[PDB]
Amino acid sequence: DVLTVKPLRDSVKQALKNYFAQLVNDLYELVLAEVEQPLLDMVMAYTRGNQTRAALMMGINRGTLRKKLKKYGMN
Amino acid sequence: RVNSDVLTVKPLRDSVKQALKNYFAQDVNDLYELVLAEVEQPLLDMVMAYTRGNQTRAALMMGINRGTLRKKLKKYGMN
């Protein structure tokens, strides 16, 4: 509905199609990593690095936000 | 910097950024779930097609157990 570029899921679908053609046991994490890092980047940019505002926007507590940032080496 | 560059549509991450930029341009408190569902649905669809419906194969490719995959499919009425 709100995530378009048309909807995002179509870009994900096409990316997976190209990937499979180029062929694994970490596909979920592989995709999550490619989706979470940019999400964290954008939300942090939007709140100017304010973790509380970012967490609240995403609907997750600050602790989980910081865990994700750390996981991707963004701390 | 980034985990991988095998997902392209021109990295997939760029599409996510564009979708978000365009979203913000349009109060939010569920952005993570919004993005998670928009990405998990197509992933499960494509993985299941690749494994021709074999759930055990899909879970193994995805790196999760049978039950978790089961839970995800149900959530998106794909069960």
Swiss-Prot record, chain A:
Chain spans, region Required for the stimulation of HIN-mediated recombination: 6-23
InterPro entries with a match to the protein in the record: Fis_DNA-bd (IPR005412), Homeodomain-like_sf (IPR009057), HTH_Fis (IPR002197), Trans_regulatory_Fis (IPR050207)
Pfam family, any one: HTH_8
Transmembrane spans: none
Cellular compartments annotated: Cytoplasm, Nucleoid
DNA-binding region(s), chain positions: 51-70
MF terms in GO: core promoter sequence-specific DNA binding; DNA binding; DNA-binding transcription activator activity; DNA-binding transcription repressor activity; protein homodimerization activity; sequence-specific DNA binding; sequence-specific DNA binding, bending; transcription cis-regulatory region binding
Listed GO CC annotations: cytosol; invertasome; nucleoid; nucleosome; protein-DNA complex
Keywords, sorted A to Z: Activator, Cytoplasm, DNA-binding, Transcription, Transcription regulation
GO BP field: chromosome organization; DNA-templated transcription; positive regulation of DNA recombination; provirus excision; regulation of DNA-templated transcription; response to radiation
Role, per record: Activates ribosomal RNA transcription, as well other genes. Plays a direct role in upstream activation of rRNA promoters. Binds to a recombinational enhancer sequence that is required to stimulate hin-mediated DNA inversion. Prevents initiation of DNA replication from oriC. Binds to hundreds of transcriptionally active and inactive AT-rich sites, approximately half its binding sites are in non-coding DNA, which only accounts for about 10% of the genome.
Protein family per UniProt: Belongs to the transcriptional regulatory Fis family.
Subunit structure: Homodimer.
Full protein name: DNA-binding protein Fis
